[PDB]
Amino acid sequence: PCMLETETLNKYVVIIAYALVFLLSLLGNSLVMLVILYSRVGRSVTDVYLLNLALADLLFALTLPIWAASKVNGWIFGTFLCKVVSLLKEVNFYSGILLLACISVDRYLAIVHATRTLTQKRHLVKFVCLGCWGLSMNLSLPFFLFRQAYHPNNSSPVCYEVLGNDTAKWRMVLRILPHTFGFIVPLFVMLFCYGFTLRTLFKAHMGQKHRAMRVIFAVVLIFLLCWLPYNLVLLADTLMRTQVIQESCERRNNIGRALDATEILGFLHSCLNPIIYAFIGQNFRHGFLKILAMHG
Numbered sequence: 001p002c003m004l005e006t007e008t009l010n011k012y013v014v015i016i017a018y019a020l021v022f023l024l025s026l027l028g029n030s031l032v033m034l035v036i037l038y039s040r041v042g043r044s045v046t047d048v049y050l051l052n053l054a055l056a057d058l059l060f061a062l063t064l065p066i067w068a069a070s071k072v073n074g075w076i077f078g079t080f081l082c083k084v085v086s087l088l089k090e091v092n093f094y095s096g097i098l099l100l101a102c103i104s105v106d107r108y109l110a111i112v113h114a115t116r117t118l119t120q121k122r123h124l125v126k127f128v129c130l131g132c133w134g135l136s137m138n139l140s141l142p143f144f145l146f147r148q149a150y151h152p153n154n155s156s157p158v159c160y161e162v163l164g165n166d167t168a169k170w171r172m173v174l175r176i177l178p179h180t181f182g183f184i185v186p187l188f189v190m191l192f193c194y195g196f197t198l199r200t201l202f203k204a205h206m207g208q209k210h211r212a213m214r215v216i217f218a219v220v221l222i223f224l225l226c227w228l229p230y231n232l233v234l235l236a237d238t239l240m241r242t243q244v245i246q247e248s249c250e251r252r253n254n255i256g257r258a259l260d261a262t263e264i265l266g267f268l269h270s271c272l273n274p275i276i277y278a279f280i281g282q283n284f285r286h287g288f289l290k291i292l293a294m295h296g
Contacts, residue, residue: 002152002249011250012154046269048102086159093178094136147171154249158256
């Protein structure tokens with residue numbers, strides 16, 4: 001029962017406004033979700049995200065009825081607040097750690113140790129995702145135990161990163177290890193190592209076969225260009241006390257608007273794709289120009 005506080009919860013309503021504002025593209029997502037995976041020419045840095053996206057969009061949407069169910073009834077019911085939203089998140093945090101894994105996994109069918117010996121490229125990566133998760137599970141295991149919380153907030157199953165220090169368990173770490181160190185540290189490291197790896201594969205990088213890797217970091221960084229300061233400054237902000245806190249439900253929920261934000265940024269997984277595609281080609285140049293002259 002988060003009904004402990006006030007009902008209006010003006011912060012949370014604004015998010016509902018977003019959820020419907022975002023739902024409308026969301027409907028595009030089942031269309032965009034299915035098309036790209038079934039689009040043969042859709043196997044870029046996003047292809048990994050598209051498999052995740054179906055899960056991220058499905059697991060989320062399957063759970064979306066629960067979200068209106070959280071406002072329709074008036075309260076919340078289940079363990080869906082952390083069991084779904086933080087749950088899918090944590091994989092999303094880990095996804096980035098894991099993303100290079102998928103890069104090495106997918107390259108492998110292309111360069112080293114291709115599959116087990118006779119198998120599709122896909123079946124492997126699902127199963128690799130399965131092994132990969134397990135190391136990740138151990139990282140996510142603390143929360144099932146005592147880290148973070150299954151505490152409620154407002155009228156929606158929205159979980160976000162950990163609330164306080166909690167040094168016994170270092171719950172503090174979720175903001176720092178999965179989040180900060182999951183993108184920013186390997187991101188710098190890639191940049192450090194990149195000159196090093198370029199030592200042999202300096203320019204050699206045709207198509208998504210190898211180049212994807214530069215792009216991989218770009219797209220995270222592009223995406224984080226926009227997701228980094230709001231999520232960072234939100235997370236810093238809630239933890240930088242003195243500010244928004246007159247109730248956990250609103251400030252813990254509005255902070256969860258961010259859960260849809262990774263859904264919304266995900267549509268870029270189909271825009272940096274045609275763009276990087278378009279970059280090498282040259283017919284694409286005037287193609288975007290084409291309609292622009294005509295406006296219609």
